[model samples]
Target chain A: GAEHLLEIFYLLLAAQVCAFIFKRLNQPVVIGEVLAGVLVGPALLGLVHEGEILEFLAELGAVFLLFMVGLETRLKDILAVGKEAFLVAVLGVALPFLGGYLYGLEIGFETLPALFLGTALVATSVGITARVLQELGVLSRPYSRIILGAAVIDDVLGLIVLACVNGVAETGQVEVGAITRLIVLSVVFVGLAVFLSTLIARLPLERLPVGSPLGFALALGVGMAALAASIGLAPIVGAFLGGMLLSEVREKYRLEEPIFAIESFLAPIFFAMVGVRLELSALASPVVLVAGTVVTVIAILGKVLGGFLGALTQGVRSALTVGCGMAPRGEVGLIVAALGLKAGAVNEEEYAIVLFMVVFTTLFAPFALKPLIAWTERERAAKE
Target chain B: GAEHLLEIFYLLLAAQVCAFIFKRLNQPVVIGEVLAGVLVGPALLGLVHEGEILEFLAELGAVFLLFMVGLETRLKDILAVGKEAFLVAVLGVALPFLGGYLYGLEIGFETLPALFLGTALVATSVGITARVLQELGVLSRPYSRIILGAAVIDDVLGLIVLACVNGVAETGQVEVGAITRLIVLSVVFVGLAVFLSTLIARLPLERLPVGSPLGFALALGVGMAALAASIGLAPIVGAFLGGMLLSEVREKYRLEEPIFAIESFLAPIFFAMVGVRLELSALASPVVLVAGTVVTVIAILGKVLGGFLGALTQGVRSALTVGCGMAPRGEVGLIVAALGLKAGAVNEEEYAIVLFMVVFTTLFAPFALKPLIAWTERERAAKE
Candidate 1:
């Protein structure tokens, strides 16, 4: 326990320090948080240890992160970009996946291993884009809205892809029927959230006391989230739906107040615990590092170019801005990578490559976007 | 997995309904949460079979609840009513404890049973008082302040009392040294948190991006909270200290924003899980119910009168107001009851009585206080 406490203190200290430096440089602190994890985790500082407590905290953090993401997302936005976003999401999933598969086949990698690499690359870390937009004061701008809209669609699409990959990996054969079922369930989950939210908002439930309505509303949210997750939908999706449902309620803000305290207290442990899960030895092999570096470059390029190309029709500069905006792979990348590794679709070496890609994209996105986005904005203003 | 998910859904739903209804009525929803548990547990709805998940969620909830409470609490505040609060906290623990013990002995209860009953009575649910004060918008008032101060002390005193009771009941001998050690450890745990916070706030740490600092800060908070709880200090104390530390920093409000999102999502789960832990059969027996009812009256009167008498030096009206304010026994009461039952210190019959005392005090205190507090405020305003 003493050791655990010390580790927590150290990890937190690292996170704080790293975050401070990042902020000083006008970058996203999440990069620092991840770096803090790497430092304290086996890969660097070696402070945290693997245990039940850490595992629980990590899971809690992911859930909270996704829930928060859901709160800020609008169903209308997702629907507005429906076909366009879906096509982009599909292409984004297909290319890297195929690339990984082909590369693995050449290198004598198993089908599962190739699939894992492909899947990890398929995720678009919208957090990176969101943070960049916030920093640049363009989050409210039209182009920013489109990118945000696309990111949300990307998240949903990523989940569907993950579910399909997981199903195929687990059963050793892709069940088309199961994949279709999952898609249906995902739609239902979001629909239910929207439907229930409307009913809740219109009801007299708002008159309840402080903690009372909060408990019931949250319970409903959690119930829906958990149910969706259990029925082969992504757990994060459930949490997102849960938050979105609550967001629609009139008294939701009041209910949300107490929840912040809970989240603040528990979510950090989750992130730090992620660091604890890392094995230092996994990064020791030079081969792994090389592979990681290569994958990292490919993953970042693929995402940035993919987003940029998809938006290119709007304008050249607009496409580049969108591409840079999509550069960083946030928690979604981490989740995808971790899942791929766990499913035995990626070996330790290949997993490192995926991890490196996530870390690299997360680290460099801000730096790359800061200048480019500004230049693009200036150009747009000049043209106008 | 599906079953577990279903159970989780039921638990969340039950807790939410209970919380919403209670909050709507201007009461603390935790009571409703507990009741919901009883309804869904094996004794009623039979929605829960395996309780591991619920237990874990409850522990997390409890920890977060205490952490937030601790943040709002100051060491200075705790010291202001040091003597009276200490006396009340100590006596409050001792009297009910002794009263329950003697009553058990007189009734020919087993030694363990008697001890358990005493231990249960020793716990004071400060959450009840805190909730009331919060609802009334008087949390910072002198009377409310004293209640909060005393409750913190009460948690410490209650834990020691419990440890001592458990020690004696188990070994048929009391260990003064062990009990003293427990007290010292509790103090040290709080001290450590304060010390760590002081150190971190003063240290030069690098910052992360705008939205990132909160995550890192919260991570630190939870780590410390966990450490404190692991070291025999109440998890709440650790969490509270963690919050206090965070509050000391500049731009704490901004740092707290992202945390609010997380808190809003998870807190309800904590309350709901608490409800899931309630065992309905314990409340079913007639003898248990009657005894519980009687004890509930005593518990309420004792706290009300004790608080009133303690505040007499301030003024009669003030004393009465303070007394009424201290009427409810919330989480602390439940904790004591659970501990007593778990330790085999209380029989099923006695455990029921303890639960009744907690529930009764919780229910009655608010009702009695509403009018008295209002009247007292009016008179005070007139005098001013």
Candidate 2:
């Protein structure tokens, strides 16, 4: 632990300076932080290595990033947009999978690998979009709430698809029974976290200071996250749910400063870790480089078209925002690719391609979403 | 990363419940946390593994525990009893080593192993005593301030003795050159951290929010801790120096609340780790058990008399409080014991005895300090 603190120091130091520069330029702080990782991490200067401490820190960063978002997400907000979010999530799921799969086939990959690619691109990374929304000060907007609600359903659907593809890759058959069990389990876990949270919030952790409830909230976040992982669900989903569960109980406790304090420290580290693994050298490989561009374009189109159709009533511009929000293939994409690699469905070269695409798609999202958000804001200003 | 979250969840859950129980019992929360570790960790249930994440959290806990102390540590408080602390540190270092060595010889260990035992016992665990003083709300008292200052000097002296002993164990002769280099480097690291802290403070990170300053403070703690580790000094020493340096500039910064938030989450994990490593089954073996008792007696007497004698003008009761504060041998003892095991001076059994003493002394200090502080408070009340 002692020997490795210096490695972490380089990352944090680089992030501090880089983030400030990005803030100055009016770019996303996440981008600057990620760029810092590329410079200081193994991709370049190699000041930071993949120690378990750094690894856990990154995981916690993503966990708390979403958890903080969950803290802000009101149940009522999500409920109001639930129907639209569902349709959007369904279309979001369909377009990305088909797009990713077809693009892989176009690159001469076999069926299983093609399907895995589709699976990777299917799930929207709620963390990325949530942070983008928060940074842009549009978290409470109706379109934003729609994105959050849709992303939740999108993740559940994504998991079922991943399970089917994974089963097929490993055993030459889809396991419908197992996938069904997973869907049920995920629902129960989400439901239970909500139920228990209501009880806890009602009690108010009565006699203790704010940390009692806030600290309890963090513990339960991890607890639910661990449970979700065991059931093949995204831990971030569980953490997000944990945050929302506490949202309604906000009147009794002030948890923002504590949660924010943790999130700011960790979420940047999470972004940097993503950037650190970018492998600039691999970006030089011509086959993957050409394919990466093709996949990214298709990936963006698939989500945009699907999410847009679902949000048709909200108008074309808002639909584009939903689509852009769904475009970023992040932790979920990497998880899918790793599964394919482990099961021998995707070779090392293909895995690298997938990883490159994941990074490309993730980095591309902020730029895509930024202009759309600005346009939406301008439209609102004009209307006012 | 997701797969292992369950382990962390268990540790945190155990700590949460146990710590709550201890607080309800009007006892130290740290004790309950340690007990929870014993129950959930390898010492009992085997639910948690010694991952690097857990290791770093423990060190961070101790780091923040002392850093918090530094926040409250005023230069004037230390200066008022600086001479007494210096003398106390000298005697405190001298007695522990000599007492440990003589006991080792009496138990028929060879000269080298005996010397290692002395080196192991030399340093005080600042975390335990610092936590105890803070819990008792007696940190501002004159005796507690002396204990803090003396512990700092004691750690440096203990490091010198440890280096000398380690040199002999490795090469059958003391290496004065290496020890001198260590002392110089340790001083410079401490000195530079303090110097840089003031400059950082004046800048006030004024252009930024309060978190910018607080965030910078946390970053500097890791930076200095890493620096200390590279130079073979305790990282906590660097963290403490970092905290004290920022002490004066604290007027503008709301560091205490945020820093305390992090410290509360991590510090209990550190104390619990100490318990997790303890093998109560070893306490049952008579030969070592009796020896443990004998050595513990000597350990108590050595620090008690040394610290007490150094603080004679403070009278018996307050002097006794300083002695109790110096009694715990924590990270340093474990480091020395580990060195002996690696060097073959202490066998497996001997290492166990040494480890037992580290835990023994660590657990003993809080109990010893509790009543002494109470008595000191009573005496102050009587004087009033």
Candidate 3:
């Protein structure tokens, strides 16, 4: 494991160089990290390998990312947009999932692989969007608030979808009973998490003498993430909720620097690992190219249409903002693809298409997001 | 991999709870972390498994420990105590290694196991001692200065010893050229690190926009650590030197908070993993118990005499301070023991005895240290 330390250097060095370019190009820092990962990973310089330690770092990074996202989101703000957020999230999830599933079938995949593809599309990675919005300093905007809330709901919803798909894959056939149990379990888990947080909140964790609110929150996040993983759910979901619970009690401890410190070190590694795992060469074949293009296009259009449908009363610009925000599948898509590969349900071509689909949407989300927000802001100005 | 997530939680939660206990008892925070590791590990609740991810976290923890140690040590401060430090370190290393080897032989262990035992005793975990001194707020005193300098030099010296010992174990004979080449390579590696830092100092790493100077230092640390690993040395040595190089430039960018945040999350895992790896049952045997006691006593006395002989002109109190500071083999002992286990050079009983030695020294170091420092402080007051 110590032998693998050089890849860390390569990843960071590549990140440093890529960050410089991203800064000059006005791209999201996350993109720079991903690019750095690809450049130094096996695809390019081959400085990093897909090893156990690297996986651990990436997992650590994911938890930190979700934690940061949760810190940025307040329950009060999410609740304000709850009804609208739920509407957008439900439609957004359902349509993309259906579209992705159909695209998989069209590409001659089996039922389970198609199911995995569908579930992958259902996930909404708020990290990329949140960072982009934070960069734009519109995190508190009404549309941004709705998008953030919607994204949170979308993630939970996607987890249920992932649970169902995984259940089906585990068995040779669709397991409706297992899916129902998992869905029920997820709700109970959230409620229990809320209950547990209330108990821990009364106990002063700050007295530990090493880290205060920051380290304290991380400890809780790690525990909750572990709990979630033990119960067959994605750890990030637990990590995100843990952050929210801690945020509720962190009125006096809204210390961003502590959170930033952990993230700065670990988050880049996570993003880069995603890039490193990617196989762009797989998309070079005609069949994969055509399939990837189709899946990715449908993946984008499905969300756009769903967002528009759900927010018919809202302005078109508002719908656009929601759609663009949800476009980036990010790590969630990668997770699904990796799981599929492990299960032997996804072949190299399928995983490659999934990777291309994820990276395409992630890279494209920011450009579309900027225009959508500008359009909404202009409409708000005109109304005023 | 998912199963490993729970262990992470167990470690953090246990660490947090134990940290509270250790705090109330006025013990070092590291003790709490180790205790937590033992409690949550296989010895007790068995929440943490000896998985690849766990090992990765432990390795990561070691890197962070050395990095933190390096950050606190200034080259000027280390240089000020150069002659005394070098003297103490050389004697400190040689005596302990020889004594441990002899003890191993007396205990009927083979040459390789004895070599591993000797190499283990040569390590001084600066993280523990520095934190102890930092808590007492005597980091700049003459005794403290020499101890810190000696510990730093001791770490480098220990690494060299580890290399030769590992070299001998791997080849089944004394290979002089390989040892010389490795020693020269290590020197050049350190020189290259110093050179690299000079280059990085001119670049605006702070402008990277994700983390501050702390994050920047970590990035450099990761790279240097990785470089060291490529050459078959322990990554922590590179991490330590990388930290020293960055610490040199960070006079203006010095923010201890960032380093603390990472440590608060990662350091506990490293310490706890050491505790988790220990099996007390092996020491319950009469032969093992007797051997452990003998080996541990020699390990302690060997360092004490070395410190005493090197600093006879300073003071007996100073020698005691240096000796106490060097007592704890800590993670370095565990690392060697683990290497032995992997190589089948040390049986379970031998590994257990090594654990006993490390934990014993770590546990007893503080009590001896407190009085030695008090005595030195009293002498200084009398002079004043």
Candidate 4:
């Protein structure tokens, strides 16, 4: 117990130091956290052993990360994005999936591996974009809102992609019927969440008591997330829906305060756990490292170009800023990589490549975006 | 993988539902979370058959909980009530311990068993009290502040008591010299934490970027907490001290927001795991159940009366409020009980009794206190 506790402390400390460096370098702290994991993982510090304890911590971290994502969601924001965001979300999910799959296939990868690669590319790390927007003070702006909305939608689409990929990989065929069924089911799952939350909100929740709302909201959120996940939907989608539903209620602001307190207390474990999952050994293969670096560059390029093109219909500066904001591949990439690794669709070499891709895009985005955003803002101001 | 994912979904749902119900009733949602665990545990729904997964979730929950506690702590708050809080904390710890020991001895319990009983009573659940205060909207009040301060102090005091009790239980006699050395070591630990934090804060931290402070604070907190725990101090003490130290720095507030988000996601897992630990068979014994009920009632009464008396020097109403406020037993009680059971100091029956005491106090406190607090408020308003 003493040794385990000390290892955890060291892991946390390393993550913190990495976060500091990342911040200093104008990068997302999560990149630092991931690096911290690598540092303490088998390849580096060797402080952490891949045991039940560390894995549990990592899982807990994922849950908390998703929960926070749910808490930060706004229903009005989702609805306001409407058709444009939907279109962007769909395209954002589809193009990369197809691109990654086709590329894998062309490269002589098997069906399962190709499918896993496709699914991996479909995720957009909305949190990273949202964080950048929040830091840049553009989070409340319309373009920012649209991007956030689309990113969330992108995650839902990614889940569908994941379902399809997993199904195909397991079954050893492109089950078009199964893919369609998954898509339909995923949609239904989210819809049900929305319906349930809306119904819960209309009830006399506010009049209950001071702490009632917070507790009720938390329960509802967790319940919805669980329900969604149970029915083959992403648990996070349930959490997102939960947040949106609660946001509609009259006492949402007040209710959210204490909930936020609870959130604050539980969320870091998720990050720390994320750090713990980083295996330095995963980085050992030169081929994997090189491939990961290449993929990382490609993923960022695709996002920047795709997002920018999609935003061009709005305005030039807006398009540039949005593209820059969306450039990072953070949690989504990690999730996809994790999935690939778990399914054995990606060996350690390929897994390392995916990891590298995830880390590079996440690290580079903030630095690249900061300059681009400033330049766009300056240009916009000059035009005015 | 699908099953695992589904389980995660269900777990989330259970947590939310429980939390909602508990909050509506003006109770701590942690209880609801515990109930959720029981529902998912082997005794009930059997949804959590995979021990490895549950264990992982639990650990994540604990780490996040500690991290958040660290984030929320303020040194100024502790200092404000330091003298009185410390005194009450020490006395509060001492009285229960002595009472438990004497009561056990009178009943002709074995030496280890008696020591366990005494140790069990030493803990005061600061988390429960803090949650109650937040729920009651009195967290900022002076009385609540004092309780908060004292509760933290009590946590530290409780650890010292545990160490001493464990020592005596093992050696079959009190070792004064060893006890003194332990006390001195604890002081040194606290002193080191304060010194390290002060030194770090005074450095050129401001010149660093936004996320830099967060990493710095986290590393420092974890490092100190680990060191303290290594020296036989309570893990919670290290965690609590981490929060206190962070609060002293200029960048404290900046780091708090993200940390809060992290905390929210992980805490439920801890509460749920606590629930999972509950063995219904232990409680099935009629004698154990009856004893548990009686002990729980007595424990609540003792704490309430002691707290009230402690506050009486200031005012009658204040005393009453403080007493009511401090009535809840939290995870600390469970830890103590578990320790006793593990050490063979307590039989399953005795363990059940202690668990029942914890659950009863925790569940009943909000119900009893809410009305009383309202009455006090009204009475105070009339007097004014």
Candidate 5:
């Protein structure tokens, strides 16, 4: 138990140090945090392990990151960009699935394996992009909203793809009825969540059985996150919506400061754990390295093209930024890869390759998107 | 994992609701938190269990609570009341031990069991007192400082008493030399900790390789807490010292608001866990109930007398407040009671009585002291 204290100390120190170096280098500080995780985590120094406590804290980090972002986002703002966001989500899932499937086949995998690969690449870890946009102080921007809205849709679609792939792999046939029912349920879940929260938010807060506003809001965030996970949506998605439910009253209760304070305390650990979970041991084989490299390239290209084409109406630079923002196949990719390995659809070599693709895309997106965002900002300033 | 999310949601929700009710009744909000824990924890609803994750969070809650207090405390303020605090610690331990030992004999317990019973009554849960004072916004007051300082010394003395009792229980003979060495080491540890932290506080902030002052301070606090525990001191003691180390720099970095925010987020969990851990099943015997009632009264009176006698110079009301503040034998008492039970020095009935004493005193202290604190405040106002 005392050692756990040391582990947390090492982690926070590593994160703070790396984040400082990255800030000095004028790069996204989150990358430094991830690198710090790699340094302190089992991947390197082994000062910290992916144990229950750290894992829970890391999960909390992701929840708080999205919740804070949602606190700054308004429902009306997201609704205003609904159509563009929907288009972005569709292309985003379609291209990644297509690229992963074709690449898997090109590498001599079977249809099911190819489908699993495609499924792995379809979802984006919106937390990564949300964090980057938050650091850039542009979360309220129109393009950032489009990315967030699309990511929520991407999660639902991603889960659907995973269900279909798992279904085919398990029984050698796709269950169309099950898939259809799932799609409808997931859609209804998201719709009802948003609608009920909005409806509740419109009522006088004082009339409710609310105890400390900040405490209640935070509890609601955690409860909704669990509810989201029970229904197969990402917990972060629910936390985001939970934040939105309270966004209308955030100022009234002065929640932003404390929430941000908590986020600052926990988010770095989440980012660093991403790097800590990376397994360089599996990447040592030259044969796997080549396959991983090719897969990684395809994953990046898929999201880049999807995001670009989906948001093309926003101009070249802005569309490019959106594509880059959407490119991080982080936690979602890892989840799908883990599922494929467990289901025997992908061998260790192929699993390593998928992990490689996930890590590369995750690490690459921030670096790739920062300049594009800066350029977009410059262009907007010039026009103004 | 999703269930873990719900667990936290229930805990926070319970704590908030109970705390709100308590506040409305003009009582300590912390009691409500404890009752919430009892409601949600294994004691009642079983909505939560004492798992590794919640336990770790509970520990963090204590650390953050102490660290937040230390941030508000100046080292000089504590040192000024050193002699009176020492007196309080010594008498505080002596009377409780005497009272418990005599009561044990009255119930026909053997000398060894009586010794263990006395040891169980020796230490005060300083966190309980620290929290009450913090709520009253009198943390910097002279009597509160006396209470805080004495609590630290009390912890050391309490450990010494337990070690001696354990030695006698295991070997049927006291290890006087070992006890002497332990006393010396414990004193040196406390002295060196305070001296070193004070020395470091005088150093130039820029000369140190710091990154994000709050994060580094938090890491340092946890690290020092681990070090303290490794050396047989309570982790919260080290956390308090750690906070003192950075007190000089806290304002420069604006650490208070965020630290308080973190504290508020976690402390309720710790307080509630005290209640959540309560086991009422053992108190069904009327004989045990009679014993528990007697012991609980003595536990209160021992502290009240020791505190009053030790700080009599502070005036009657102030001295009484000090005595009442130190009355809660919280975690320390439970630790001692567990050690006795494990050593077979205390039977089930006696163990239940000790636990009853712990629970009763813990619950009683805040209510007992609140009016005293208010009256003290009124006296000060009249004098002014």
Candidate 6:
């Protein structure tokens, strides 16, 4: 157990030092944090192991990141961007699915494996985008809201795709009834979450003699995150919903103070973990390296092009920023890759390719998004 | 990973709700937290299984707990009561050791098993005492300082006792040279910690254009904790020294804001974890139950008498308070018991008895000390 603490110490020290260097160099701090993982992890020093404890902390980091984003977000803002978000999610899913499936076929994969590739590319890691935007303090921007909203839709759409692919692999047929059941459950979870949140907001919780409303808030956030996982949605989506539930009533509760502290301690570890899990050794084979490179490029282009077209109404700069924000496949990509491997839709080599794709986009998104965000801000300032 | 999140969610929710109820009932919130573990843990609902992640979180809880206590404590204040603290630690270790050993002999144990019983009773859990005193906001009191100082000494002494017992078990004799080396290492570590801390205090860290002083502070604390574990000492001892090192520079750094939040999130989990690991099935055997009850009584009496005698200069009431504060065996006792069990000195049945003693004292100390603290406060007010 103390060894686990040492692992955390190596990770945090690596992150802090790297963040300092990155901040000095005017690069995104998260990029440094991810690279920090590579430094301490198996890819470099091997000072840290990706153990169960580290994985759990990484999970917490994502949940808390989304929760904080949710804290700053308004339900109304997400609703206002509903049409754009839906369009973004659809395009994002379509282009990636088509690109991945076609590429898999071109590379001689069977139908199920091809479908699995498509599904793997379908979901986006809102956690990655959310953190980058949060760091820039631009989460309130219209395009950021569209990205957040679209990510939620992306997760749901991705879940259905995964189920279809999984069903085909397992039973040689698509289970429409199971898919419909899943969709209903997802809808009910969100609907009930919103309805419950609205009710709680109206309550005079401030007047209630509650000791540490923050405790209850944390409980609700984590509880919903668990609920989300139980329902096949990413736990972070529930965490976001949990935060939004309290957003309207936040002033009365003053929950952000401690929440921020928790986030500050945990989120960096989560970001660093993204790098730690990367297996650079997978690129050892020239053929695999080339294949992985192609997959990675397709992943970025699919999301970037889809996001750009969906947010075209916001103008090219904002759309570009949105596109970059949505580019990171992150944990969602890993989860899809794991599912495919488990279902025998992909073998070890293909799994390595998907893993490479996930890592590249996760690393690429923050660096690419930072410049676009700066340009969009500058353009908006000039217009004003 | 999501499963681990659910485990945390269960623990935190249980702690929060229990704390609320306990607060309403005018009991220590930590008591509620412990019961929360028992509720969700194997003793009851079994919603959470003690796993690597939970253990890591629990370890962080203790380290952070001690760090928070150290943040509130001044080095000079502890030095002021150095003699009394040394006396407390010596007597506190001696009496319980004699009692546990003699009791073991009376129960027909052999020499090595008897020695193990004594060794198990020698260490005090400063985390438990520190938390209890911290909750009462009286860590500044003379008796509390003595307990804090004494616990540090207690840990060092306990280390020596464990090493001697371990040495005898393995090599069939006490290795005096190894024991002497351990003492020297322990002294040098603490000596260096103080010297380094003083030097750091003199540095204009506040003016160094650092990014997030809190990050550096945390890194230092955890880094030192790892260093301490690399040696024979408990990680929490290093964590305490780490925080104390920064105590003078704390105001300049403005660290307590986030430290408090981190502690609030983690410490309850630690308290609850003590209860989570309890094996109630051990008590089902009538012989073990009877033996455990007797051992628990002896453990309490030995500590209270020793502490009361040591702190006699502080007057009777304060001495009693100090005694109660030092009562909890917590993790320290469990460590000794584990050492004994592994060495074949203590059988599984004896191990059960030792475990029962640890849990009872851990649960007992807070309840007993709260009243003593309140009474002492009232007495002081009346005198004034």
Each prediction's RMSD to truth:
5.0, 2.6, 3.3, 5.8, 2.2, 2.2
lDDT string, candidate 1, B148-244, tens digits: 6566666787777767777876787879898888888888876776677666556534433323555556665667667766656555556666766
Error at A286, model 3, angstroms: 1.7
Model 4 per-residue lDDT tens digits across residues B246-341: 665635457655555444554666666667666675444786777666666557666676667665654666666666666666667877887787
Q: How far off is residue B96 in model 3, in Å?
A: 2.5
| lDDT by residue for model 2 (B85-133), tens | 9988999989978999999999887898888778777868878788778
Query: Per-residue alpha-carbon lDDT of model 1 for A1-384, expressed as tens digits?
Result: 445555656666776666667777767655666677877887766777665545555554555555554455555644554444554555555665666566666556677777777777777765446545654556545455556556655666776777777888888677788678877876776666777765655665555542445555555555665676676654545665676666655244564445544444444555455445544533457866776776677777777677666666557766666666666666667778777767677777777767777766777886777777677788888878
Q: Count the backbone clashes (under 3 Å) in each candidate.
A: 35, 0, 2, 20, 0, 0
Candidate 3 per-residue lDDT, tens place, A143-218, comes to: 6777766775676688778767776767766577766776787778877865665565576665455434665787
TM-score result, candidate 6 = 0.95
Please provide, for model 2 over A226-333, each residue's C-alpha lDDT reduced to its tens digit, 9 standing for 90 to 100: 777787777787778878888877556787677877787778788777677666636559877777777777887888888898877677778889888888877667
Candidate 2 segments exceeding 4 Å error: A207-211, A381-384, B74-80, B198-200, B206-211, B313-315, B381-384
Point out where model 3 deviates above 4 Å: A102-117, A163-173, A194-212, A281-283, A311-314, A341-352, A374-384, B101-117, B159-172, B192-215, B312-314, B340-352, B378-384
Higher-lDDT candidate among 2 and 4? Answer: 2
lDDT of 6 by residue, A200-266 (tens): 7778555543347887788889988999998889889999999989888777777777787788788
lDDT of 4 at B377: 77
Model 6 local distance difference test score: 0.85
Model 6, runs deviating above 4 Å: A204-211, A282-285, B204-211, B281-285, B382-384
Candidate 2 C-alpha error for residue B68, in Å: 2.5
lDDT of 6 by residue, B1-384 (tens): 668778888899899888878888878888888888999999999999988778888888889888877777778888888888899899999999999889989998888888888887887888878877888789889999999888888888989998898988898899999999999999999889878876877885545433478877888888888878877899898888888888888788788768877888888889788778888746458778888889889899889888898888989989999888889998778778777887688888889888888888888888889999999999988888
Model 5 alpha-carbon drift over 4 Å, by segment: A173-185, B169-185, B207-209, B343-345
What would the per-residue lDDT of candidate 5 be over residues B1-384, giving only the tens digit for each residue? 887888888898899888888888899877888889989988889998877888788888889888988888877988898777889889999998999999989998789888877887787888878888998899889899888888888888887888788888889887998888878877887887788777765674554444577778888798878877877778888888788777777788798899888888888888777777788844457777888889888889999989998888788888989999899977778777877888788888788888888988988998989999999999998888
DockQ of all models, two decimals each: 0.30, 0.47, 0.48, 0.26, 0.65, 0.54
Compute the lDDT for candidate 5: 0.84
Per-residue lDDT, model 5, residue A375, is 94
Best by DockQ: 5
Q: Please, what are the lDDT tens digits per residue for candidate 3 over residues B1-384? A: 566777777787778778778877866667777788889888888778687777777777777766766666666766766788879889999998998888888778888898888887787776667657765778667667677667656766776787677777687766778667777886787667757655755776655653345556777787667777776566776777777776756566765567766766787788788778766665348766777788889888988788877766577867778777878777677777788788777888888788778888876776577767878888878878
Q: Give the worst 10-residue stretch by lDDT in candidate 3 chain B.
A: B206-215
User: What is candidate 4's TM-score for chain B alone?
Assistant: 0.84
